[PDB]
Amino acid sequence: DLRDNETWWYNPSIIVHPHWREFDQVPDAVYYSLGIFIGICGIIGCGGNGIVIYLFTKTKSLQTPANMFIINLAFSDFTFSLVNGFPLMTISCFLKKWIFGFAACKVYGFIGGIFGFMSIMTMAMISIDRYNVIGRPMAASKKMSHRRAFIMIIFVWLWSVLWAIGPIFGWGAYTLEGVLCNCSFDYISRDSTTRSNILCMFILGFFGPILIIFFCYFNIVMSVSNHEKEMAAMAKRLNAKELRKAQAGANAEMRLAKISIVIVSQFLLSWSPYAVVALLAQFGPLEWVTPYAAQLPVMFAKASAIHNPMIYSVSHPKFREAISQTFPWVLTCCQFDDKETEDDKDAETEIPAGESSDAAPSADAAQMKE
Ligand SMILES: *C/C=C(C)/C=C\C=C(C)\C=C\C1=C(C)CCCC1(C)C
Numbered sequence: 001d002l003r004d005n006e007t008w009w010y011n012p013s014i015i016v017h018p019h020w021r022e023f024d025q026v027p028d029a030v031y032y033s034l035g036i037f038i039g040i041c042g043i044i045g046c047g048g049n050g051i052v053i054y055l056f057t058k059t060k061s062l063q064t065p066a067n068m069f070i071i072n073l074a075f076s077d078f079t080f081s082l083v084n085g086f087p088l089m090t091i092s093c094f095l096k097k098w099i100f101g102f103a104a105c106k107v108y109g110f111i112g113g114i115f116g117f118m119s120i121m122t123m124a125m126i127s128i129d130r131y132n133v134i135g136r137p138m139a140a141s142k143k144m145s146h147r148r149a150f151i152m153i154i155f156v157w158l159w160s161v162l163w164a165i166g167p168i169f170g171w172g173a174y175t176l177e178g179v180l181c182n183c184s185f186d187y188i189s190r191d192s193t194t195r196s197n198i199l200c201m202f203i204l205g206f207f208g209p210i211l212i213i214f215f216c217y218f219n220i221v222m223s224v225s226n227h228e229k230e231m232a233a234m235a236k237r238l239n240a241k242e243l244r245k246a247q248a249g250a251n252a253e254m255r256l257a258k259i260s261i262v263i264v265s266q267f268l269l270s271w272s273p274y275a276v277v278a279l280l281a282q283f284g285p286l287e288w289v290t291p292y293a294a295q296l297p298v299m300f301a302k303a304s305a306i307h308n309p310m311i312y313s314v315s316h317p318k319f320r321e322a323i324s325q326t327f328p329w330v331l332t333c334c335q336f337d338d339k340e341t342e343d344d345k346d347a348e349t350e351i352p353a354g355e356s357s358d359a360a361p362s363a364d365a366a367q368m369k370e
């Protein structure tokens with residue numbers, strides 16, 4: 001009353017949770033780090049994703065419908081970083097307090113919300129593609145089509161949102177956390193309403209995808225055993241340059257799938273630790289969930305949205321191709337060599353004169369036109 005005080009942790013527009021109050025304040029330096037640190041991720045991430053969008057949307061050698069996913073992901077993880085990063089969290093941090101609106105805090109999360117599920121759920125979609133290009137027997141393969149793709153996207157979106165929109169209507173809720181500088185979902189209060197949402201969040205916005213992801217990269221792994229007989233047995237029926245077109249086109253997609261695995265490898269590790277912390281604080285030793293118990297790990301997890309680019313930039317071919325032509329200075333520590341792209345190119349050579357036995361071909365692979 002007339003210049004209100006209580007402690008550091010007091011935040012005028014947001015109802016802190018008692019738990020975050022029962023501790024003593026973190027030092028002036030962690031906040032700044034927490035600032036500086038998540039500033040770096042605003043940059044890096046809105047960098048990569050931006051580029052990534054920019055390349056994959058312009059570079060002609062990449063208009064493959066399957067990639068519109070890459071786009072989507074580059075997109076999600078961008079937004080995320082944009083918002084989740086600067087300006088909100090970094091300032092809250094530089095000023096040990098969350099300057100922005102209550103709704104500011106409500107959104108900050110929702111965003112991350114959508115865009116956490118987006119990235120993850122999306123990988124699934126990709127993984128679906130790889131299965132249609134590698135797990136199913138050579139004979140039955142279906143490459144991605146501008147149509148299917150765009151539907152999936154939309155399935156994704158609706159979804160991504162659905163499971164994070166809950167809190168925006170009181171089922172669960174978003175407030176401050178850790179050092180009260182960022183914002184996040186409510187995993188403390190164990191009432192019937194909050195707890196109910198929380199579990200859907202885990203099963204629906206997270207496991208739900210994982211099941212699918214795993215379901216593929218197994219069905220694929222196991223169907224490779226079979227591939228060597230198919231790449232050797234239909235390696236008899238062909239010329240010396242159509243076999244390379246078959247192995248090169250089978251040696252490449254492979255990589256794409258290998259890459260996306262290393263991503264899901266990425267996503268899985270950065271979120272789960274915090275994720276674990278979450279459930280704990282929702283089911284076990286709440287006394288444990290100390291400041292660092294939530295904040296130090298929620299960082300690694302927000303960070304999860306800025307690796308893909310770096311990862312790609314050390315392993316995707318066609319990409320590096322485009323990097324180097326407009327932005328080589330980035331590949332400064334992982335330079336390009338004309339070699340890598342050969343494997344691909346030979347996938348797109350044409351047909352008049354080579355392979356025509358007395359058992360003529362017509363394959364079934366997305367060529368319908370009105
Ligand atoms: C930094 C602010 C954050 C991370 C706010 C919100 C996060 C979510 C809605 C997260 C949902 C999930 C994550 C991060 C990992 C496990 C699965 C999940 C759906 C509970």
Ligand SMILES: *C(=O)CCCCCCCCCCCCCCC
Pocket residue numbers: 040332333
């Ligand atoms: C070759 O080694 C490429 C990586 C070079 C590492 C240099 C970057 C270190 C992290 C600094 C982050 C940007 C700082 C922005 C200016 C303060």
Ligand SMILES: *C(=O)CCCCCCCCCCCCCCC
Pocket residue numbers: 310313314330331332333334335
């Ligand atoms: C080609 O150069 C590909 C890019 C290589 C990545 C450069 C690494 C800089 C990333 C900064 C983050 C590392 C800080 C250490 C914290 C674990």
